[PDB]
Amino acid sequence: AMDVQETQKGALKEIQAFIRSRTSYDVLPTSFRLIVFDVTLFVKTSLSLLTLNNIVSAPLWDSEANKFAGLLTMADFVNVIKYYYQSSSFPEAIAEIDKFRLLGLREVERKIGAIPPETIYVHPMHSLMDACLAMSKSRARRIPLIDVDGETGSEMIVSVLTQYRILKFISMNCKETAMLRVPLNQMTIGTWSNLATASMETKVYDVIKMLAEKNISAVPIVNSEGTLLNVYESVDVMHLIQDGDYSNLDLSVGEALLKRPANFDGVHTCRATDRLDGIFDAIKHSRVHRLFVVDENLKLEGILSLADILNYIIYDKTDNFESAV
Amino acid sequence: NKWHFGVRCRGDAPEILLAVYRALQRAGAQFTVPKPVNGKYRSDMYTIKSRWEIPHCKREGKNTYAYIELQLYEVMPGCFMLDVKSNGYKDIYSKSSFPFLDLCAMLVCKLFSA
Amino acid sequence: SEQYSTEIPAFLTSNQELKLPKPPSLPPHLEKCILNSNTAYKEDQSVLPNPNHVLLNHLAAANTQLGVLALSATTRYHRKYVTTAMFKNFD
Ligand SMILES: Nc1ncnc2c1ncn2[C@@H]1O[C@H](COP(=O)(O)OP(=O)(O)OP(=O)(O)O)[C@@H](O)[C@H]1O
Ligand SMILES: Nc1ncnc2c1ncn2[C@@H]1O[C@H](COP(=O)(O)OP(=O)(O)O)[C@@H](O)[C@H]1O
């Protein structure tokens, strides 16, 4: 625990041992709501329920079986949209996904390879490390916590854990975050080359085929000089298609962006000289979903996503589709 | 348009009680019945205990059951709540809101299509 | 253990001019549903207050303007509480 790198190394071990010692259940509020959708819900209705509840995602319920039937995220739309844009000779064909029940949308995704065979879940009373490792293995950014009622065989969806709520939980509870004082430019962490970026003139469909192919949740928007202006997230796709208007997919990123409500998480940035202590501190007080590494001139240099951070702190060291967003 | 306990009803309480029993019977539930104490009926007639076979269990050969108690309340003259609560699940051989809530949706559809 | 029946009581199936008892009036505790709360939605909008232990696994309901059913119940999961709000078709 001697110099900076040696104090950080130590602190990272304390943080993993802590993740291992807690369960996923430990992360939950004492009392909370869980919004669940029937898999036979129409796609349009489900987007409408997501907007009106200010959520971007919901667990699915096959009520006949009494079984968890998957996780509806924006990756579902991003993947089918991308498939239709790559494979269809007919631009209006995409509209057809409004005929679909959630069951039928998922079957299109199974067919194209956008859904894995083994669907991903952990037990709520198992270690939190299980949740991290599953998310790390799949590239899922949320994971359902499922128990089973032994009297009925019925599956009990307890909650759905997010990378953000796990990092928040750690920031709030592990004092060791304050000892992570190594600058980013002396760590192997984040992505610093071959970045996927867009401009305000970029078509939304080209961004959305960036998100699927690269399997990222967001694309930074830069200008001619490379200065960071904004972001286009997969959650923004929801606002574009919540009304049934799939020709909104043909808009420039600029036009699309002018429709965004003031509800925005925000665009967070840091410098290559910043450290994980300050980052966990921002996580503690703000819904930060990623950090764009910039210079003094707001020039984009890299990306530090939540997955980047989690995957750094949990390891001893030592398809063309978006995963669950 | 906010969340409220139960289902809203109006009109006559014996007419509502009848409609509830008819809905239970269409859904396939089994239920207790009003007994008259000294020939006369008591307001406990508005407390119904129901037993429901669980479809997913029933399909796999199982005698597992869900217990749901219904309670009619007057909110004000003409307006009633049907309160509906889980008493649990039991298999013939020796927690969760499901299948309870999947059964309540069944009841609600029968009440609404009567 | 109860006497379960399959058939509708016959006094209810008669053509009404019978002198019957009234249901109990609504108790104060079934007037407020905790889902109508969102006190702390800046930090975490899923956070609810602790429920009245007597209102565990009572059905709650909401109107939607969407052609679907909204149903919920609160239950204890070990020492925490989950209020699941479910959206479901009629057919
Ligand atoms: N625009 C981009 N171009 C290239 N690589 C990226 C870009 N954005 C993220 N990455 C990298 O690609 C991988 C996928 O990132 P991703 O954004 O999916 O993280 P995440 O799990 O979604 O967490 P967050 O929600 O915070 O982004 C990560 O290792 C990330 O650092
Ligand atoms: N299916 C759901 N049911 C109930 N609440 C949800 C659901 N999805 C999200 N929320 C709530 O919405 C808020 C923002 O959620 P989200 O953006 O999905 O996750 P995070 O904030 O963890 O990245 C959180 O308070 C979360 O608990």
Residue B42: name the closest of C16, C1, C19 by CA. Answer: C19
Other Cβ atoms less than 10 A from the Cβ of B53: the count is 16
Q: How far is CA A178 from CA A170, A174, A175, B113, in A?
A: 11, 9, 6, 61
Under 8 Å between Cβ of A256 and A199: no
Q: Which domains does chain A have, with CATH numbers?
A: 1-181 (3.10.580.10), 182-325 (3.10.580.10)
Residue C5 is classified by DSSP as B
Q: For testing the chain C interface, which of B41, B101, B103, B106 should be mutated: the one with the most C CBs within 10 Å?
A: B101
Q: How far does A94 lie from chain C, in Å, by closest CA?
A: 23
For residue B76 the two structure tokens come to 């004000």
Ligand nearest to the CA of A191: 1
Q: Give Dmax over CA atoms of chain B in angstroms.
A: 47
**Scanning every residue of chain A, which has its alpha carbon at the shortest distance from the alpha carbon of B93?**
A151
Give the atom of ligand 2 at the shortest distance from the alpha carbon of A54.
12
Find the CB nearest C21 among B22, B43, B97. Answer: B43
Instruction: List the structure tokens of C41.
Output: 């939605």
Chain A residues within 8 angstroms (CB to CB) of chain B: 61, 63-66, 149, 151-156
According to the entry, how was the structure determined?
A: X-ray
Residue owning the nearest CA to atom 23 of ligand 2: A164
Name the minimum distance, in Å, from the CA of A146 to any CA of chain B: 11
Which helix (H) or strand (E) segment holds residue A204: the answer is: helix A204-214
* DSSP secondary structure string for all residues of A238-280: HHHHTTS-GGGGGSBHHHHHTT--TT-----EE-TT-BHHHHH
C79 and chain B in contact, CB less than 8 A: no
Residue C87 has its nearest CB partner, among A29, A30, A49, at A49
Q: Which residues fall within 8 angstroms of residue C48, CB to CB, at 6 or more apart?
A: A29, A31, A32, A33, C34, C35, C37, C81, C83
Resolution of the deposited coordinates, in angstroms?
Answer: 2.4
Is B82 in contact with C32 (CB distance < 8 Å)? Answer: no
DSSP state at residue A187: S
- B5 CA to centre of ligand 1 in angstroms: 44
Q: Give the position, in ligand 2's atom list, of the atom nearest the Cα of A235.
A: 17
The fold adopted by the segment(s) B1-114 is: TATA-Binding Protein (3.30.310)
**Cα distance between residue A291 and residue A98, in whole Å:** 35
Task: Measure CB to CB from residue C85 to each of A30, A33, A45 and give the nearest one.
Answer: A33
Residue among B51, B77, B50, B49 nearest B65 (CA): B51
Contact by Cβ (8 Å): B111, B11: no
Asked if B74 contacts C23 with a C-beta cutoff of 8 angstroms, the reply is yes
d(CA A44, CA A242): 7
The CB of A36 under 6 Å from ligand 2? The reply is no
Which of B82, B4, A32, B71 has its CA nearest to residue C32?
A: B4
Q: Say if CB A200 and CB A254 are below 8 A apart.
A: yes
> Is there a contact between C35 and A28 if contact means CB atoms under 8 Å apart?
no
Question: Rounded to the nearest 10 degrees, what angle do helices A276-285 and A163-173 cross at?
Answer: 110
Per-domain residue ranges of chain B:
1-114
Element (H or E) spanning A166, and its range? helix A163-173
Tokens coding A302: 């890299």
Q: Are A42 and A219 in contact (CB under 8 A)?
A: no
Is the Cβ pair C24, B43 closer than 8 Å? yes
Task: Give A81's contacts (C-beta < 8 A, 6+ positions apart).
Answer: A94, A205, A208, A237, A249
Residue A81 Cα to ligand 1 midpoint, Å, equals 20
Query: What's chain C's length in residues?
Result: 91
How many angstroms from the chain centroid is the CA of residue A108? 22
Could you give the count of Cα atoms lying within 13 Å of C13 in the half-sphere of its Cβ?
6
As a whole number of angstroms, the distance between CA A213 and CA A194 comes to 13
Closest Cα to residue A268, out of A260, A278, A258, A259? Answer: A278
